[PDB]
Amino acid sequence: HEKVTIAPLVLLSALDHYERTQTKENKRCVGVILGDANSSTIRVTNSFALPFEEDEKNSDVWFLDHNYIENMNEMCKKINAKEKLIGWYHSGPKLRASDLKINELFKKYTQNNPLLLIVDVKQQGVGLPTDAYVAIEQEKTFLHLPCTIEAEEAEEI
Amino acid sequence: HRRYDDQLKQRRQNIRDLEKLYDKTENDIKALQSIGQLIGEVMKELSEEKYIVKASSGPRYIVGVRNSVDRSKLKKGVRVTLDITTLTIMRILPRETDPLVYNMTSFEQ
Amino acid sequence: MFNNHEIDTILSTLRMEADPSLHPLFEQFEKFYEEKLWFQLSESLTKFFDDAKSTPLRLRLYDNFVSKFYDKINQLSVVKYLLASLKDSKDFDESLKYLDDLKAQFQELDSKKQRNNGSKDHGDGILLIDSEIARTYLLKNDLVKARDLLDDLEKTLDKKDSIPLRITNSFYSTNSQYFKFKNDFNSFYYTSLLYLSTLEPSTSITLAERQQLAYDLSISALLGDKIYNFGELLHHPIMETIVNDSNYDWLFQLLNALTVGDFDKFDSLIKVQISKIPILAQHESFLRQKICLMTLIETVFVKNIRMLSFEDISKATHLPKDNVEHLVMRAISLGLLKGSIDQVNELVTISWVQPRIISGDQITKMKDRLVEWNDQVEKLGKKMEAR
Amino acid sequence: IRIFRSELQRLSHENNVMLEKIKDNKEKIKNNRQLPYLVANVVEV
Amino acid sequence: MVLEATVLVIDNSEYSRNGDFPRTRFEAQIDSVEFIFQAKRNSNPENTVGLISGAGANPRVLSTFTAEFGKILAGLHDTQIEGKLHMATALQIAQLTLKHRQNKVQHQRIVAFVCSPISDSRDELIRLAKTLKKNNVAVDIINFGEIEQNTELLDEFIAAVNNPQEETSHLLTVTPGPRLLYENIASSPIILEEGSS
Amino acid sequence: TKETVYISSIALLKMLKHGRAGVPMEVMGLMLGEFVDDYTVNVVDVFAMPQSGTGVSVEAVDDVFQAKMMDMLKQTGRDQMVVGWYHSHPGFGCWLSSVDVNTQKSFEQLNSRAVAVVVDPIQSVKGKVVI
C-alpha cells in the first residue's frame, strides 16, 4: 500500500472556512488538496475549499464547479509550481452519494487516485481529526492509508 | 465540400503542435520554482543524524539528514548535497572533485 | 418458434427509423429456420435476453452492419455477443477460420471510430482485440504458444481501465483454460475464483452451466490444499446453486469428512478417474491435519496454551506414532505453518498463521480474553491517578 | 459536413483560449527574464 | 426585452440508444447551442447559458454559465450516449446551478432534451413542480424518442406544473430524420417570444 | 493608537511558507481582513502574489491575479477588503525591506490601514517566531 503525510497547517486551515461560511450540520464543505502523489508517501502541502452545495433530503444532489478548480490550478502555478492536484477532501462525518459519485469527477484533473478525507469538526475521539481514505476499482471499498502528521522544522515549532 | 474541411485538417495539426508548447512553457515556470542546492563533501561523522560537511566555499557546518537518503553513503569521503536555507542534506550525487571536462576530455578525432 | 420469425423482425425495424440499413435477404433468411427453433445470433436487442448456440446463417450478413449496431442499441452487443460469442457455437469447421472476420476485418480500423467520430465514448477498441488473441491457441495447436500471449493480456489489464468487470474476468478465462489441461491446478483454482466468485452481474450463465462451472471448481480443489478448503465454496454462491445428487455433492461430502476422517466414504461415491491418483488422498489428509494444527493457539483451549502431542494427532488423523512424525514435516515444508516438533518428549510446537472461514469457535474467547483486561482497569487505573 | 467543420473550427477558438493562457505564461517569463542577471560557470551539464 | 438564464440538460435512457437521426445523433444538440447563445446573449445582456447532464454517464455539470458557448461545446466531449435515467436528480441539480450565478433575481429557464417518457414517480414530479413555481423556474422539455412519445408522466409533469401562463414550460416534438433541430427550437417559445418575466 | 496586527495560526504559517524557497529569493502576497483603527487588527486569509521583473516593488502587484483570487475566496466566505501587503525580502538582513522604501506612501492612498509585514532573518524559528 501507500502512506499519507499531512502537515498540521492543512488540517486546521480546512476547519476555518467551515465556520466562516456558517455551515450547519445539514450542509458540508468540500475542497481540494495539493502535494506530491508520485512517491509511496502522499504529502499534502496545501488545501483549498470549494463552494459545495448539497440537499439534505437527497444524497444524489450536489454542486461542483470545475471552472473554479481550473482557475485554482492556474492561480497555484504562480505561487508554487511544484504542487499538483493529488485529490480532494470534504467535511462532515457522513458518507452519502454526494461524496461517492464526485470521486470520479476529480479524477479527470488528478493523475493519481484522489485521496478522500473526512475532516471532523468536533474532533471526537483519539487523535487524527482527518482520516485519509483511498478507493479501489476492484467491489469498491474505502481503505485508510497510514496517515501521519509531519511538517518542516519551522512549521512544527 | 472538401475545401473547408482540408483547411481545418491543417489547423488540427497545428493544434497538436501547440499542445506540446503549452506544457513546455508551463515547465519553464516549474523549472524556475526550484531553488539552489549546496554541494559539499563529508569530512567527519559527528553522530548518526549529525554530520560535518565542508561547503564548496570552505566553511563547514553541522547538517542534518532526511528520510530520502541512505546514511550508509553519507559517510566521509563521499560528496553529498546540502541545503542553502536550513543547511541540511537533501539529495545524493556521484563523487566529482572539480568537474572540469575540458581537462578530462581529450577531444579525440 | 414464430416469435423470432415475426416479432424479432419487427423489433429490428423499430430502431433507427425503419429498416436500419437492412439487406433484403434479412427477411428472406428468417424464412429458413422457421419452426426448427434456430435463433442464430438474435442480433442485439433480442440477443440480450435470448441465447443462440446454433450455427448462424447470417454470420457473413451483419458483418458489414457492425457500424450500424452502435447506432441501433449499443456497442456492447458486439464486444460480448454476436461475433464475440462465436466461440460458444463450438463448431469443428469454424475452428481457426475466424481470422478473417474477427481479426482481419477488425484490423482495418484502429480505435474502432475513424472519421465518423462522435462524442467519443470510451469502452471500445480493447475487448474486440485482446479477447481473440489468446483464443487462437486454446484449440488445435498446444497451449505452449498461448502462454507467450497471456503475459501481454495481464500487462494491458493494469495499465488500462474498464468499468465493466466482465472484461477483466475474460482475461482470467484464458488463463483458466491454460492450466485446465496442465498440471499444478493450484493456479487453476486461483484463476477460477477470480473469474466468478462474489460478482453477481459479471459472468451471467444459465443454471445448467453453473453445475459445469462448479465441477471445475471441485476438481481443482481436490489436488491442492491452497486457498482455505472445500468449505470455502459453501459461503460463496457455488454450492448453494447446485444440486445435492448426481455426484455434485462431492464438495459437501468432504466438509464433514475432515472431522470424521474416513476416506472410504468419499472414495465409494467417486469414479475411477480421480481415485487412481494418490495426490487426492495425500492432500485430503493434509486438510484434516490443518484443522488440528490450528488448535494450538485458539480453537478449544481457553487459556491459549500452545501445545500439541503426537498422541492427540494420532487419533485425529487415524495414523500411528511413526507416520505422524514424518507427516508434520510435510505440512510445514509446503508453507502452511511455521514451527518445529519434539521427538524426545513427544511434543509439537506450532504457531498459527493462515486464517479460516469458520466462525463461532473463537468468538467467545476473543471476549473472554478481554475479560482479563477488565480486571486490570481497577488496580493500575486508581494507583496511577493517585500519584 | 456542416457539423464536422463546426467542431475543429470551434476547437481552434478554444485552442486560442489556451493560446491566451500560454501568452500569459510568456509574459510571466518576460517578467522572469530581466536584464541584470549574473554569470556563473557550469562545471557539469 | 427578455432577461433570463438558460440551462441545457442532456439526458439519456433506453429510448436514446439510437445513434443516428439523419446520418448521426447528438451532434444536432451540439449544433443547436450556437443558435441559442446568439439569439439571447448577443441580442440582449444579462442572458447566460449553462450546461448540465443529469443522466447518461454521471449526473455532473459539463459547463457553467460563461460569456461564450465554446466552453459549453467543449464540455460535451467524451460523453456516453447510454446510462441511467434520473429525472428528479437532473431537476434538483439545476436548481443548485441557478442558485449560484451572476446577475441574480431574474427569470430562470431550463432547456431539457429528453428522449424518454420519464416514468419514475408521480408524486415526486408534482412536489418539484411547486418548488420551481416559487422561484419562477421554467423547465422546457423537448421530446425526441421515436416519432412522438406522449400520454405518459412526461405530459403529467407539464400539465400540473403550470399555475402561470408563460413561466413554466412548452412542448416541442421533433420528428426523427433529416430535420433541422435549431429551426424548430428557434420558432418555439423557448427562445425569446413567450416566457419573459 | 498605532496598528498592531493580530495574526491567526493559519495566516502566520502561510506567510512563512510563501517565503520558504531560498534565502535570497524574495516573494510577496496580500493580506485580507476587517478590523478597526485604534488598536485591534485581524487577518482573515492571505495568499501569495506572483513575482515580476522588479522582484518586490509597487509595480509587482497584479490586478488581474488579485481580482481572480478575490473571486475564488468569495465563494469560501473568506472575501474581505484589502488591509495591506506582506513581503519576504532576501537574506541581506540589514534593515527589513532591501528594495521598498516609499512604496508604502503610495499604499496609503488606496488604504490608510495598509501595513507591510516582513520577516527580516528569512526563516529562523527556535523558541519563537520573529516577524
mmCIF file of C-alpha atoms in Angstrom, chain A residues 53-54 58 60-67 104-105, chain E residues 58-64 89 92-93 96-97 99:
data_model
loop_
_atom_site.group_PDB
_atom_site.id
_atom_site.type_symbol
_atom_site.label_atom_id
_atom_site.label_comp_id
_atom_site.label_asym_id
_atom_site.label_seq_id
_atom_site.Cartn_x
_atom_site.Cartn_y
_atom_site.Cartn_z
ATOM 1 C CA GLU A 53 -23.941 22.870 -2.090
ATOM 2 C CA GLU A 54 -25.942 19.779 -1.139
ATOM 3 C CA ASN A 58 -31.402 13.829 -1.330
ATOM 4 C CA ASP A 60 -27.882 12.478 -5.315
ATOM 5 C CA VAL A 61 -27.896 16.307 -5.259
ATOM 6 C CA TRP A 62 -24.554 18.114 -5.232
ATOM 7 C CA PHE A 63 -22.994 21.251 -6.709
ATOM 8 C CA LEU A 64 -19.422 21.038 -8.014
ATOM 9 C CA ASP A 65 -17.907 23.635 -10.354
ATOM 10 C CA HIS A 66 -14.754 22.584 -12.198
ATOM 11 C CA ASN A 67 -14.233 26.110 -13.559
ATOM 12 C CA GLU A 104 -14.556 10.223 -10.404
ATOM 13 C CA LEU A 105 -15.084 13.909 -11.237
ATOM 14 C CA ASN E 58 -22.871 10.644 -14.437
ATOM 15 C CA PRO E 59 -25.168 13.488 -13.093
ATOM 16 C CA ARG E 60 -22.493 16.185 -13.350
ATOM 17 C CA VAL E 61 -22.155 19.753 -14.637
ATOM 18 C CA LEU E 62 -20.465 19.898 -18.037
ATOM 19 C CA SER E 63 -20.117 23.686 -18.310
ATOM 20 C CA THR E 64 -21.272 26.570 -16.129
ATOM 21 C CA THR E 89 -31.818 14.304 -9.955
ATOM 22 C CA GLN E 92 -32.767 19.325 -8.426
ATOM 23 C CA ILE E 93 -29.168 19.835 -9.575
ATOM 24 C CA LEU E 96 -28.425 24.492 -7.374
ATOM 25 C CA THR E 97 -26.863 25.775 -10.605
ATOM 26 C CA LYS E 99 -28.729 29.404 -7.119
#
